[PDB]
């Protein structure tokens, strides 16, 4: 019984979203790859290189035209005619456009593909640009975060395979299931916020009792994600549980909203 074809491409990025995917606890990434999808192209994991990798890319997008899902990690730079990111001797943007043309739908993994992330922070030397400003004629599901949560990535994949449809999205293209509520609206330190019980300097008595991180710059009040509910790494922790405020890493432009340690 055939599995759905998936092409996974990489622009300007740090590879954190691929690393997050392989951390999945349920289903294991092994079982996603062997039993749920056909991961037919992926630079980080595939055996073939060079001309052999170009043959796989060409063959899959032609054979499965109109029927594969395109996963995108990273983004295209518009500076230097696109040659800040080079793939087979040519601008990355050319490979992005050819892969997008045959896809049935696109998943934009991470803040890079969704919005820009760190390379797009001031002064954006390469003119790094998110996927939806280049590809304008295809369904794009944004899954933001730096990176997104591992078991969120795998839950979105299983939803699409099991239910044979795209997740319903908000006005920005984010899945409602995991991005519909703010971090601060499901945070276990909210009792302390409401009582005016705050950490004021690192490792003070308040910090040692798990008081709220608002005065240390927490951006939870303006950030939509699942970190305070689903949590990270098989439910082990999340940024605030281990004592650091949320940076805002799921939101467009979070690097340029002032210092991480200045109040929301």
């Amino acid at each position: 019984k055939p599995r759905i074809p998936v092409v996974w491409i990489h622009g300007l990025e740090c590879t954190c979203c691929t690393e997050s995917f392989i951390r999945s606890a349920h289903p294991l990434a092994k079982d996603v790859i062997l039993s749920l999808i056909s991961l037919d192209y992926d630079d980080t994991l595939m055996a073939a290189a060079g001309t052999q990798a170009e043959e796989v890319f060409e063959d899959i997008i032609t054979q499965y035209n109109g029927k594969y899902i395109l996963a995108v990690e990273g983004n295209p730079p518009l500076g230097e005619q696109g040659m800040f990111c080079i793939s087979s001797g040519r601008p990355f943007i050319e490979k992005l456009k050819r892969a997008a043309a045959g896809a049935s739908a696109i998943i934009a993994w991470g803040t890079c593909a969704s919005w820009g992330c760190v390379q797009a922070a001031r002064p954006n030397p390469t003119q790094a640009t998110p996927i939806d400003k280049v590809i304008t004629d295809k369904p794009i599901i944004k899954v933001p975060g730096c990176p997104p949560i591992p078991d969120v990535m795998s839950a979105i994949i299983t939803y699409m395979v099991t239910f044979d449809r795209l997740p319903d999205v908000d006005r920005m293209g984010r899945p409602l299931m995991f991005y519909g509520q703010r971090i601060h609206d499901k945070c276990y330190r909210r009792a302390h916020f409401d009582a005016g019980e705050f950490v004021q300097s690192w490792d003070d008595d308040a910090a040692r009792k798990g008081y709220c991180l608002y005065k240390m710059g927490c951006k939870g009040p303006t950030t939509y994600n699942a970190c305070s509910s689903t949590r990270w790494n098989d439910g082990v922790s999340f940024p605030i549980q281990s004592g650091h405020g949320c940076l805002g890493c799921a939101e467009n432009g979070f690097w340029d909203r002032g210092s991480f340690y200045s109040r929301v």
Binding site: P2, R3, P5, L12, C14, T15, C16, E19, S20, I22, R23, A25, A29, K30, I33, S38, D42, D43, T44, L45, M46, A47, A48, A49, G50, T51, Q52, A53, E55, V56, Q81, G82, F84, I86, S88, G89, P91, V118, Q119, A121, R122, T126, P147, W202, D203, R208, K209, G210, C227, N233, D234, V236, P239, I240, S242, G243, H244, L247, S259, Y261
Partner: protein, 581 residues
């Protein structure tokens, strides 16, 4: 065509030109070109970084306390090492000393990363260069169980287990949807494992893909999440409370018990799965002890890492030794100084950057990152590189040198430095390892040796995790809980102008961050990263870097199938996002 001599090599761009773009099973974007002679032997090799983002430019104007979070995103594979170098650099500039528990927890973060990064590289990135996955379908499950049981005490070895793994692979391939195995190099004559060893190795590939997720739960406890954990200038944010009200809000005995459980499992996997598989690859591929030497018998470099005395970065503190060897003289390990302008310098005469004088090298406190895409004649156009022009500018990677010398960094470099400084544990491990393979010491200076040293280091790091955990627990038993210093948190307490260096040994080699602070903001932030050294382009003297040297002189069986090129490049664990930043 032309020819010249450097470092004992004859660099000759006559003959057939081969291009490998993209290089896969690495982090990020790389292109490689070679020329081969009439005997199918490489006489020229060209290393090219095919991406750039500009973190050094983006960091200007930031608050120094925020810098770690930005530079962490240089890389998601070596996640955390750039945050560590950043907080070290900012603390060096301002004059901050952290508490002992913060230093111990940082050392746990770094040892955890070494274990994770080395394990995933061995199986998921390099493994398919050595294991013929499709040949595993021809194996006898009972003979596979016998082989595995001869090599290890690991429990998972039954004939039924190996039959079940084989059958899962059979069902996966039978419909033609080969996924990550499509159009691979299967059957190439350089695949030398017997079928039973291929099925054992493939089973272990799957076990490692599952198990690696558990290792980073240590980063989740102390750092909130992985990838990309959190840190602070002044220590760590993970406040400790063992025996007071509100321990539910802090690192408590339950959280510490979780960490101990992960340490034990991590050591057992590395020692009983990874270590025997590395030795088996060595037993079946002994000729690779004489291929890919490159610079490893000439020039090697380590900064050192793991300060065991808090806030002391000297020789008596660092558990992983630093030093440099040049000119093949392993009897004189030289001291490294990251402030000395005559030591670390970067050249851009063969890279896509502007300097006022491209014939000189700049120390990072004098560094310039002014991108300039200028490929010259590439037999196509500026947006269609058919053949890079290695006589001119050919990469987004700058060219670092040490006292003007081209160096190799990473696990093999570190092992050679520690061995020749006389570290007793290293000498005994290396000697025992080469004895078991019936090879001379010189066999470690090779593509095979890089792989063997990486596995040895995963074992070393798993041991040090337990040592550091025990040190933390001793402090807690003595009532010493502190995790942050905040005396100099506020900008009004800092010098008006100051500068600092942060350094460590990342999984791939020597890492430095150079930072200058003025008026409360970052004035300059320059990074030199391990893959920047190894993947370097040429300099004004025409000297070649570690990758180009290791490829020189290599025989190819089938020019159109670049398996030998992939084996040697992957042995260094290239990280291209790191190299360019």
């Amino acid at each position: 065509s032309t020819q010249y001599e450097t470092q004992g090599y004859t660099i000759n761009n006559a003959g057939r030109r081969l291009v490998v773009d993209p290089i896969t099973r690495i982090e990020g974007h790389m292109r490689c070109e070679v020329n081969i002679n009439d005997q199918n032997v490489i006489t020229n090799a060209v290393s090219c970084g095919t991406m750039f983002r500009g973190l050094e430019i983006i960091l200007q104007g930031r608050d120094p306390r925020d810098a770690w979070a930005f530079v962490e995103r240089i890389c998601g594979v070596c996640t955390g090492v750039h945050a560590l170098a950043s907080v070290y650099a900012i603390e060096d500039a301002i004059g901050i000393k952290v508490p002992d528990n913060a230093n111990i927890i940082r050392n746990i973060m770094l040892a955890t990363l070494w274990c994770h990064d080395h394990l995933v590289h061995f199986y998921q990135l390099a493994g398919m260069d050595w294991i013929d996955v499709l040949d595993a379908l021809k194996a006898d499950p009972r003979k596979t169980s016998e082989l595995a049981q001869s090599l290890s005490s690991w429990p998972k070895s039954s004939p039924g287990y190996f039959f079940d793994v084989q059958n899962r692979l059979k069902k996966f391939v039978e419909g033609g949807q080969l996924g990550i195995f499509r159009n691979g190099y299967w059957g190439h004559p350089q695949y030398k494992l017997p079928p039973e060893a291929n099925l054992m190795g493939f089973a272990h590939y799957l076990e490692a893909l599952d198990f690696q997720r558990e290792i980073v739960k240590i980063h989740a406890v102390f750092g909130g999440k992985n990838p990309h954990p959190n840190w602070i200038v002044g220590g760590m944010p993970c406040a400790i409370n063992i025996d007071e009200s509100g321990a539910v809000g802090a690192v408590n005995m339950e959280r510490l018990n979780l960490v101990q459980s992960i340490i034990t499992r991590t050591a057992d996997f590395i020692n009983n799965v990874m270590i025997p598989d590395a030795l088996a690859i060595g037993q079946f591929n002994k000729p690779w002890s004489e291929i890919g030497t490159g610079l490893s018998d000439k020039c090697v470099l380590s900064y050192g890492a793991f300060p065991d005395i808090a806030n002391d970065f000297g020789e008596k503190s660092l558990l992983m030794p630093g030093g440099a060897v040049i000119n093949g003289d392993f009897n004189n390990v030289l001291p490294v100084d990251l402030v000395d302008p005559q030591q670390v310098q970067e050249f851009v005469d063969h890279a896509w950057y502007r300097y006022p004088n491209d014939q000189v090298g700049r120390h990072p406190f004098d560094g310039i990152t002014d991108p300039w895409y200028n490929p010259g004649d590439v037999k196509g156009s500026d947006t269609n590189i058919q053949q890079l022009n290695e006589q001119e500018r050919y990469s987004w990677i700058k060219a670092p040198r040490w006292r003007g010398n081209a160096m190799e960094v990473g696990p093999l470099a570190r092992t050679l430095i520690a061995y020749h400084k006389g570290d007793a544990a290293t000498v005994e491990s290396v000697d025992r390892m080469m004895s078991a393979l019936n090879l001379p010491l010189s066999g470690i200076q090779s593509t095979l040796g890089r792989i063997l040293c990486r596995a040895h280091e995963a074992q070393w790091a798993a041991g040090k995790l337990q040592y550091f955990f025990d040190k933390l627990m001793t402090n807690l038993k003595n009532g010493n809980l502190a995790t942050a210093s905040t005396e100099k948190w506020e900008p009004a307490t800092w010098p008006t102008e100051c500068r600092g260096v942060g350094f460590t040994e990342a999984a791939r080699g020597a890492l430095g961050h150079w930072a200058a602070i003025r008026d409360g903001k970052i004035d300059l932030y320059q990074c030199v990263v391990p893959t920047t050294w190894n993947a370097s382009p040429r300099d004004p003297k025409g000297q070649i870097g570690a990758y180009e040297a290791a490829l020189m002189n290599t025989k190819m069986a089938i020019p159109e199938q670049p398996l030998e090129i992939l084996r040697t490049l992957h042995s260094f664990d290239p990280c291209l996002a790191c190299s360019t930043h």
